[PDB]
Amino acid sequence: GPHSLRYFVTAVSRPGLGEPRYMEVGYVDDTEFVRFDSDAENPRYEPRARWMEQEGPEYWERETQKAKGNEQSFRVDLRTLLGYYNQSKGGSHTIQVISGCEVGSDGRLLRGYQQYAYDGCDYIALNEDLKTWTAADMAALITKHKWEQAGEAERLRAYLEGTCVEWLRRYLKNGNATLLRTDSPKAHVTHHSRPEDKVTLRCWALGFYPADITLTWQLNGEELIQDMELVETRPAGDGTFQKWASVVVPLGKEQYYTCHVYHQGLPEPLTLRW
């Protein structure tokens, strides 16, 4: 299967109530395994997965330094950006960034990336060529140049192709199994009376992992994509996930419909009915 290591960093300024906050969280296969919150009691990097606690003190010291070091340099960036865009000093702003790599089922690198975002809007990003940059506006153009006339793409590419995939294996070695774990969804439909002789059926699905899942209602072999109404897959709070997809049907004719639950943890899709 495919795997990917990535880092979601956030440096949000906020005048009037403390200094700018810097958070650094990493993900392995879309699962948070590491973190660092400038707001923590003892601001430092900490594991988020049991299989991450193996790494010794030497590892966590290096990462904490990196975060402590970046956190500082990002604070300027917020100031640097204040001038590029010429905004006052009082309105909190925020810079985010996603960077990492994706590894194919064969082990190769599928793609390496890095995307910056000032105030929720795109700012600058490393192209697929891993050598050029793509600015979104004129402010990015400066950074673009600053990085070109500095040799940034080569150093970032070196990390995306070296550090990323290497340590990806490291973590993946003692974390793959636990990541591949699966908890089948505990489904069932619910009945709800509605005005004008109708009736709404809600296809539930609780306690499943991973979060990816698909619930679809059907009538005579037809998926009711538009007549449907589902919710955002929300965390149950116990590692598992919940979700539900309902559809309105006519009373009596209620047993003619069924939602098919598709989930990794299922050898065959379920078929619920009221």
Binding site: Y7, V9, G69, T80, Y116, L156
Partner: peptide, 8 residues
């Protein structure tokens, strides 16, 4: 692992 970011 953790990357060392560059200034804007």
């Amino acid at each position: 692992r953790g990357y060392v970011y560059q200034g804007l």
